[PDB]
């Protein structure tokens, strides 16, 4: 068996959702911000936000909504986790003591059901009579909000419309009414139904189905002054209330997909809309009052306000202040002005909240020769693309270097005192026949620049047609200086060439240090790339020189230096190249038993291959023979996001299901079959998507630092900005920390009453297993934050083993020292 | 696709056994003894008739590729039965086959099993499988005797006497090289034909075509009487040389 | 000739790697040196010599040389390790069962989450599986181990059935005692949970129905660890076994023993209401408790769901390959 420890170095920074209301007091205006597994509670002031409370939950926050049922003084919070854990929460404050009350809780998972394409949707009735959940295709789940439903028991109503895009509870209806945009073969439609708690079924809804835009994406429930619904698309915004149908199709919104909405004026007169290029719009509902004493909707208008960060969630606070929650870039507070500035914008940034964004890749480099190590991450996407330099000093110091284009891979080249970074920018087919970039970026603002003139695929004869307005990716290699981070050079790759992999190394007997890039020829027609290049560059005297190119018959997904040879993965094939005295790559040996060799790692003459669907394989190079030998494979099937080698026997992998696992050689030589079965000995639900595993640590090492129980250091970067560390334990230390977890879980009160053991259980749609081989460092490091009565309750009857004492009792003070030492690794 | 497992009578003059100096009578004797060894051993073990026959067909085929002087027959027999049990889903442990073999064999014969009987049999399995070219599925005259008899309608007692008499002939044909000359379908017809001649029955009357004097042709196409008589002659010669007389 | 199996050497194949672990040996992917065809080699080791050549392999050789259908896997030949020269006793080299190489296996495609099935893809999948199951049942053979890992589909949309290690002949007239525990617990029929031991070809149909439901949810229907918990899950959906629906349930060894928590009513149509009508009816008939009322393979091929499927329109499943990275 294997024993390992996982700790969170930086908490998730991406804003996944944001709501406003009156949660902490019926008087205060609150802003609740949801990051993955984290809830942040703020109070709105005239200058910005006053933080008041932050809690963690043992689950990914999927639904977050505030509501106030009749009889309550203040808003209650509903949260549903991605594992279908539901709860209702209340804020309670006793002077200086702030705690969160779990008023109702339960798990709403169905034994049978198909998870929907557009994900979990949760909505609440305007009269707070029920919670609507869309979890599975063809089913609508109702949790009625009666006082007695402390377990959140619920029932399903059959839904004929299997493919639902979005749903909201409508306002101004005699009964609870839902408006949803659904898809069937005839296009998209908007339909309404009524929800009967007494009959536990749908009844026919207020207004007829109307055919809507093919890409109708979002539903807005308009308030009482104008009752009805607004439907947002790619080209058009339409309003449907009974027989009234109004539609506006302004050309400005066609340019970029609108992804978020929020109401500015409670009457429903003004709504905010945001799109992928960061543009912020005002949707103004023009009023017409009729002599009948009735208010109708005269027209819909869209006005451009300015630019914000590419926003996942928008929420208007008060006065002119709007909170911009971004998953791709930094979140913000921005102020909307009545008067435009001299550039024509009504939006002026107030504060910027760091978001490590999507961490596509990262490397650890000791820039100041300090023995410490700093993390240079490829973070953000599109216009919010950035490099972020992260160092310890008690809080992490983070420097942001804007790239304004999507960064893909990073590697450090010390000989050149610079970094190589792969990046891609979005250009659009323009009337010249060529393309035009939407904004300047690093690949265009480089001091010197080049464009590969390779003739490898020049023969083409493959017709690819272009329509005006379509997007394309343009890929570059950026040479960025390690002190200034000035983009010294930008190399543009071939048209339709994607840069997928990057290394910096010396090969063979060649003393020069090269930047090597692996690419793929990507055409929309192809299911899987069938052409690609390995390109050898040399950065010398401020210029990048194309040294050599090797044509391959696939995508070079991953490369790594291997004892002076180049190890590259081309689709199914895993290949080892030698670097000749003629400065050309020469194939030595190949391995073909793979579906898609997405990830490669090495140690000595051993190679760990990460496959698209077949998890991880341990390969070896037999130098005596000049070829590859399969040592052992993980036959349990898994979709891999990244892999890493821990030591000669233990191997770490990440799943696309937000799960982590460790495989070990069975080390039992009874049969050849046993030796070839990598056995999964560690299983752990991380809750994050790991893109990059990287050996290194950010802790200062003077050699004088007390030696921690943990051995080894692997840092990993995730989609939500979370950075973590995996380290190994001895059998004795694991058992101690594991036994302590079981004690802590009985003592520590969970938000929503979610069992910790359930949360960390390995979870796929098809499987669920108890965690094994992994210590949740955050539970261990919370021992220091529980009250003294609880600390002594935890240590009661706790015994040590396999050490100086075979059975030694623990006191609360003994563990405080151990956990404090464990806090030194993060 | 599938191998050919039938030879002509004239070809049996050129089995390996014959060419190493064994005379026709001796090889015929060895075949009878090996088959009857397989039969008796499996009968003691309680084995189905198909399992006994499958082993015999393996045994008979085996000595179409090898010589009796280099492969002791009772070891071969025991191995065939052992494999047949697995093929026909009536398995037995090799130790149990050896046990029964010891009871039925005298000390000289059990000497063929050498110092380690179980091992000598288990080792031969590799050769047996390669010899029969991994064609494990075998059909036997029994199933056809019953499929054809079911289509006869008439005196219940005359047809049952025909079947049992024919069944006894099938068991006896396993001791011969007929298994290697004619498909089982023909064997089943030949034994019905033989039982008919001896019982003074006219089988055509029991068929759906009572005025079709060559009654078998509706069961087995393209079979001349020449073949049925050749088969009958071979079975009856076994009864004449031996003490036993026609079953009746 | 092509029929002389057991003699050709495994030298004739370049071994590409180990595709999976089997029962009687490991399964390797290989390329034929002469033709370039991709094959799958199953290793049979008689070196153990506990009881000689494994019967699981004997079944797969005996049956698959008889069965010739598009939806049944094809054994091409049996080849051997270099044998010891003129020393047959010392020879411990293994034998290899050569099969066609199928691109993927259903469990791997689903466990990895890399498949989406439209109704039309499920139509093509099931028509092939049941047509091949029908072929086998017409030949009086029972598979007895129908799981997602024994269903191999290549990217062309052709489905083939594969692990016949447990297959045995079934006679309707002659009831025979058979091994109780045959099909994997997730896909095990209800009668075998009570231990019929004289079961019908309907056992395989129940497993295929479990697959039919699974293809519409992407999650197996009856996931349990113990035989009782499985009967409970089946009962929550299909109804509890009782003479009212399964008159002969009282004859089964464990009927009185393995009672579910309640006498549940059948909800199959309610919990699967999101399924097309033509398909839902097929599921209801395939997941019938009483095996003598459970539909046959042929009857499913004469159903509204499968009757009018043209196998010219293979309709391969949606396998993502590019952009799976980003
Ligand atoms: C032996 C014969 C019946 N056969 C013929 N083609 C196949 C077949 N083909 C599906 C298959 C193809 C590739 C891979 C694969 C590829 C790369 C790396 C690791 N595995 C796995 C399964 N997979 C199986 N099984 C797979 C699971 O274990 C047992 C064998 N058997 C087969």
Numbering used by the authors:
A (entry chain A): 1 to 393, 708 to 1140
B (entry chain C): 20 to 267
C (entry chain B): 715 to 1040
Publication excerpt:
Recently, several unexpectedly diverse compounds were reported to deplete cyclin K by linking CDK12–cyclin K to the DDB1–CUL4–RBX1 E3 ligase. Here, to investigate how chemically dissimilar small molecules trigger cyclin K degradation, we evaluated 91 candidate degraders in structural, biophysical and cellular studies and reveal all compounds acquire glue activity via simultaneous CDK12 binding and engagement of DDB1 interfacial residues, in particular Arg928. Crystallographic dissection of 28 ternary complexes demonstrated that despite considerable diversity of the molecular glues, the overall complex architecture is highly similar. The low-affinity DDB1–CDK12 interaction primes the complex, while the ligand, through filling the kinase pocket and bridging over to DDB1, drives robust association, offering a rationale for the unusually broad chemical diversity observed.
